[PDB]
Structure formats: structure tokens, C-alpha cells
């Protein structure tokens, strides 16, 4: 078989690994789609130029009209692109709760959905995976896709917990009086800032709880600073089983693609044959508290992780554009979830969820404000 | 569901963890038989009123006098028991190639074997793996153990490598020239055979032998790096580039309680890796220059045959001398080599258990005269 892939968000750091990757394997890939924002004019051209097929979306509008030939566009053209493409792979590459519509789509064609696009599952919700099929979403996201391998290794009752590693970002080991004088400059793109404030960390302690069916209480976070081990799996007998590899997307990229399949070649093992070490330490959660957050907006379940991301997006680029130091970020989004105790029910439509974000920026940037 | 398990080696270590997995877990497990040297008394008549087996064997015929009420004694007694015993699990943790007949009597039951004597498939090779059903045989050794484990991460051709983690034993680090003064009490939580075998790494050596012949993959794709922490007890590297590692604070008890209940995981069988604390877990190389046991062991296996019964029957011999006090430590291995380079004739594979054997003598008879003249 030679399987048809979509790609959101292509001219991003995933989807561009992600094309080569396939270029690299023309035998098991093809591409037949490719969505951007438009921001990022030269990539794309030099990106439609190599593949084949000119279906492609762009976002942003002032864009699309600086290149013309654009089978779509609007704010909504990435999710046009996927109704009408047929495919047997999409990889929603996508970032922020704007993926969540594609993420819909791609799910409603019966097609696999590699998803890159963490923030489309953690504001979707039960209502994403009341649109899936079991094994049909495949996470392209590194820490999943190494629990996914590890699972492999027993069976769903002898899972003990799940133990997600995390880096600890560039202000590991920092106090929370230094947090205070956090620079954009030093914290750098919003997915390089969820990572030093730890937002990101919390958003993929929902996407184990939704991806895998596991209770918050036994899911893990480590700090290992040299993202070696992409995170593991202990077992009721005691036993652990992990994932290892020098740290490369493309790992997790071509499990997704070719899920079962494992790519030869796709990434560089481990070398065995030179000096290492892996280090372990706790996570900080006085000075890092967006974890014990999501967990906790994770619990209370239905539109509030909606909420949770939401915020973030809020105040994450508010503190990107100077308009807030680097601990308010977390302070508001801990703010927006006290207030927000009616976002506990469940999401029985898209705009439930689309009503909860809106909620919630409003809510963010009033505080931002105040 | 209740599964009756032989336990050849009781008293010993393995078999004492093995014997408490079991008083653990009687719903899961029924210990029918028993199997010792006659060396521990107090500890037997101790594992008889614990467990209610009178069914036991005694190698020390004078030992089985002693200790009265017992069925089978002399050498053949433990494979006389597994003959005559019911079961569905042979637990065979006795310690070197005598386990062999054992090991194949228990095949020829159709009882799974659960091997941590590594020795008899060493030894026994490929006529121990034709008396075998696919499955039958499930490691009990630590390294295997997670070997299996990390398997389950791929199909068979999605395998590059298989890489085996050592401890390093007590002179990791050390030079070629510092192991000259190495003395048997250095050299010595296992038994004292295991633990000279651990420090020498001839271990190492069998477990790479080991590996080859309960996974049938291939010695240029087995390899060996040193973990001082022994937390990761094995890995496996697929096509992709990814690996996929087996993890635990080392307790025998984890990988004993899985090969009884193979596939089924034990409840509460060992302690997890906790992290509520910073750790880190290391590897290094090691250095064939100074261990030359693991490369030696690669070759033996590659020559195949008898080959393999030939390095761990010289190992045996020479381990022995050097606890006798009669060699220095880096002989071990010097003489492990230089009866294997001389066994040209040895290299066919045996057609019956009698081949292993006298590959065996003629091993342990060469060993001796090296460690003479
Ligand atoms: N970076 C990584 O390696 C990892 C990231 N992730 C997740 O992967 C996802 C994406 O990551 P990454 O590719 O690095 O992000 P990038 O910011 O590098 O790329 C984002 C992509 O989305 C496009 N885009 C921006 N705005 C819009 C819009 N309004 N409509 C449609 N498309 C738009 C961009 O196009 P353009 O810029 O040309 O306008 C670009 O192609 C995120 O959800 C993240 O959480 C998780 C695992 C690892
Ligand atoms: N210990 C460990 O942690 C590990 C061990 N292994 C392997 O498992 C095997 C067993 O190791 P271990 O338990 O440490 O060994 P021990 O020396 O602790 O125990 C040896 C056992 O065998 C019995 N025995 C000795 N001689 C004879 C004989 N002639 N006939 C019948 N029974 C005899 C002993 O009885 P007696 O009471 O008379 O001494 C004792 O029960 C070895 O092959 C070892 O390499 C593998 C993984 C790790
Ligand atoms: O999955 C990944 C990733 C993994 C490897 C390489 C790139 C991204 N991420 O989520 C990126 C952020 C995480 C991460 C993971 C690995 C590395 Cl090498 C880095 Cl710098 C950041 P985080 O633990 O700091 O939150
Ligand atoms: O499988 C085991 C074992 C593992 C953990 C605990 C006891 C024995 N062995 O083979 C004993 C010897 C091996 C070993 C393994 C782990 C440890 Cl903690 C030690 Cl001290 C020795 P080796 O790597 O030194 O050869
Ligand atoms: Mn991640
Ligand atoms: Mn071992």
C-alpha cells in the first residue's frame, strides 16, 4: 500500500520534518494536500513546487492573494481542505484550539488522523473522541508515541501508570523570584513558550488521560532534561518498560504515518558504544504549577480543559507582546479556571466548546487588563 | 487456572525467591516438587513443612539419609524427579551444565521450562532447541526476561539489535594489569559460581549465547554495554532507529514471576522505579582488552555445534581452579581462549546428548592440563 496524506500545517517545524520524511519514502507516502496560514509566503511556494498536486489552503486572506491558484482559503480553509480530499492519513500539524475543526473533519472521513495538534484533542474532548474509532487517532506527539510502543507491552489492566517525561524547559532548576524577569528572548514559537512555562507539559497530561483512558492520579511527570526517554509504562508487576532515542521527530512522525509499521531508517538509534547518562528529578510544582492545573481542570473534565487551553493562548501571547511578566501567564489561567465552574458540563456540540474558548479568552483579557 | 511448578534448585537463591513468588501468590501457583544438593538441610526441611512436598530430590545420597522420607537421590535424582513428576512448569535453578539433563527431560514432559540455568542451553545449544516447542522455553534470567518484554514493541524483522546491559561486576573501570591481584574473596546476591562468573564476565559471555539461542537472532546483532546501576535490565533497538528498554530496581522476583505465570503479569511481583527522587542511570563501553570474555563468547557461539558447551565446560574447570586458588584471575579467560582455539573438531552439531557430553570432557580435561603444566 502507498498511503495518501494530508498535511496541516506543512510550512511548521512538524509538517516540514513530516514532508521529508514521506519525500524520503516515496514507496510507503504521497502527499495530496497541504495547509498553512499564509504567513510564511516563500516555504509554501517552494513547498507546492516539489510535490505534485497544487490543493492546497491558505488562512490568512491579504495572503492567499499574493499567490493565487488557492483551491481555498478563509479562516476555515484548512477544514474545507479535508472534507473534499480523499485520504487514507491526516496529519493535523496544526497549532492552538484553531485545529479543532480539521481535527473534526479528518476524523468524519474515516481516514487515520496523525495528530501533531495537541490543543485540537485537549479543548475537544469527549466530543473528539465520540467522533473516532478505536487506533484511528495515531499521536504524532513524542511522549505519546512512546507510550503507545510501551503499552505494547502488556495488557490494558496490568497498566500501572503512565510517566511522562518532560525536559523542564531552559528554567529548570530556576526560583520563582527569577521567574519574575522572564523575557520573551529567554522563553524562545508559543509551543517553545508552553514548554519553559510548563503549559505544554499540563496540556499533554490531558492528551495521556483522553489518548489512553488513564486516571490523573496515575499519570506521572518526570523531569529528564535530556529528552532521551520519550516516557514509560509501569506495569502492576513492578516492571517498566520505555522508549529511547536521541531526541528527532521524525521518530514519532513515521510511527504515525505507517502505524503499525515501523520506517527503517526514520531516525539515529541510541549509541550504545559512547559514554551517556540519563538523569531523573522531580518537577518542581511550587514553582511550576501548570501541571498540577491541567490535572486539576483535567478532573473537573467537560469544557474545562477547553478553558484551560484557552486561557493560555490568551495569556501567553499577552505575555509575548510585553503586556504581562512571565508568572501571570499561569496565575491567569489558574484565575480563569476558579471562575469557571459552569464549563463543567459536557460538550454535546462544537460550539459548546467554541462558547467555552470564547468565555475564556474574554475572560483572559480582562485580566490581562486588570 | 492453579499451576503446578517443579522447582529444581530450591534452596539456592533463585529457588528460594522463585519458592516465595509462589507462598505469594497460591491461587496463581503450587510448588508439586523440589530439587537440592543436600549442601542446606535446614533450609529443605524448612521448604518441605512450608510448601507440603514430599516429593523431593536429593543429589548427596548421604545428605537424603539424613534428612529422611526421600524419593529420589544420586545424581540422576533431579532428572528422575521431572520425569515422574506432573507439572506445568519446570523452574530449573540449578547451577551449571548438569542442569542439562534436567533441562531436557523437562522438554520431553511438555511442561514449559522456565531457565534460569542458563548453562544447559549454552551447553545443550541446538539439541536443547530441538527437543523445544515455540514458547516452551521462557528465561527466567534477568537480561532475557526483558528482552521478551521489549519484543513485544515490534514484529521479528522490525529488529536491528538486541543489547544486553551488565553490571560491570566488582572491577568495572579496572586495568588489564590491576586484575592480576584480583583474589577469590574480591571476586565474591547470587551463589559463588554466578558471582566469579558475574566479576570475570563469562556471565556476560553465556547471556550473549543465551540470547542467541532463546531469540534466534544473530551474534552480529546482540550487543553488550555496561549499566553500573542495573536498573535497565535490557533493550532493544528497532529499524526505526527507536529502543525500547526494560526497567526496574534489580529483584529476581520480577522476571521469576513472569516466566511462571508467562504472559501474565504478578501483581505486586517486584518495586517499581521511583522517581519521586533524582537518579540517573549510566553506560559506558567495556573494554575487550580487558574483558575479553563477551568477544570470545561471540565467537564460540558463532562456530556453533559444540562450540558453546566447549567455553562454559573450560570456564567451569578454570572459574574453579581460580577459587581453588591454584590460577590468577585473568587465566579464567586466557585458558577459556586458548581451549577454544584448539577445538577445531568441536565446531559440528551434536546428535544426541552423549556429543555434549564428550565435548564437555574433553573440555574439562584440557582446562585441567592448562591449569597444570
Ligand atoms: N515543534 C515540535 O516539534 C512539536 C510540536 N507539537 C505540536 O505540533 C503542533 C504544530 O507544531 P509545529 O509544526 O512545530 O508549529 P509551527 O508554529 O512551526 O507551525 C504551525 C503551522 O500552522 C500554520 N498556521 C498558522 N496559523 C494558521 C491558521 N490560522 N490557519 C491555518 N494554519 C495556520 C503555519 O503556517 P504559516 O506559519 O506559514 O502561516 C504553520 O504551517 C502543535 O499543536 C504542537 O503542540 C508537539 C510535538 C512536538
Ligand atoms: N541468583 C541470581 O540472582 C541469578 C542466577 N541466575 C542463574 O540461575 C541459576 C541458579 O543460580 P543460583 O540460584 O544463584 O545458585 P545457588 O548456588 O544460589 O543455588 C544452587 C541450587 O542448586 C542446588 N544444587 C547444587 N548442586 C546440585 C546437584 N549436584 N544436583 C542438584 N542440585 C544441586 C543447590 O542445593 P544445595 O542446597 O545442596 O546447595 C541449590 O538449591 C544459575 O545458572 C545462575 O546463573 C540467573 C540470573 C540471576
Ligand atoms: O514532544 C516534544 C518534542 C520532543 C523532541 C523534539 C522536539 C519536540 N515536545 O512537546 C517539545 C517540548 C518538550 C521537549 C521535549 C524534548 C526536547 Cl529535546 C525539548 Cl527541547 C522539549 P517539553 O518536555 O519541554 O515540554
Ligand atoms: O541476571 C542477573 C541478576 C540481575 C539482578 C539481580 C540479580 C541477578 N545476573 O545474571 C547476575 C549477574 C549480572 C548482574 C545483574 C544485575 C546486578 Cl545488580 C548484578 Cl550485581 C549482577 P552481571 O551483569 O554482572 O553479569
Ligand atoms: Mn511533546
Ligand atoms: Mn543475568
Known sequence: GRLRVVVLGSTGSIGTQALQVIADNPDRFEVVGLAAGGAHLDTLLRQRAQTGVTNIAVADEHAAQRVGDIPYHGSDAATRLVEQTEADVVLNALVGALGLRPT??????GARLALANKESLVAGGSLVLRAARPGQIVPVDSEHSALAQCLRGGTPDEVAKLVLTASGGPFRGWSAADLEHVTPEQAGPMNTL?????????????????????????????VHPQSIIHSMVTFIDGS????????????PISLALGWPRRVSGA?????????????????????????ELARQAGVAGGCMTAVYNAANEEAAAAFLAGR????????????????????????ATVDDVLDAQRWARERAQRAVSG
Open 104 to 109: 473534526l473533519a479528518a476524523l468524519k472521513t
Open 267 to 291: 531516525a539515529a538509534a541510541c549509541d550504545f558504544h559512547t559514554a551517556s547518562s540519563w538523569e531523573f528529578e522531580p518537577l518542581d510544582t511550587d514553582v511550576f504549577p501548570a501541571v
Open 240 to 251: 517498566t518498560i520505555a522508549q529511547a532515542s536521541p531526541p528527532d521527530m521524525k521518530l
Open 194 to 222: 508552553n514548554s519553559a512555562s510548563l503549559v505544554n507539559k499540563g496540556l499533554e497530561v490531558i492528551e495521556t488521560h483522553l489518548l489512553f483512558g488513564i486516571p490523573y492520579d496515575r499519570i506521572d511527570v518526570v
Open 324 to 347: 504581562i511578566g512571565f508568572p501571570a501567564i499561569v496565575g491567569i489561567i489558574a484565575d480563569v479556571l476558579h471562575a469557571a465552574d459552569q464549563w463543567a458540563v459536557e460538550p
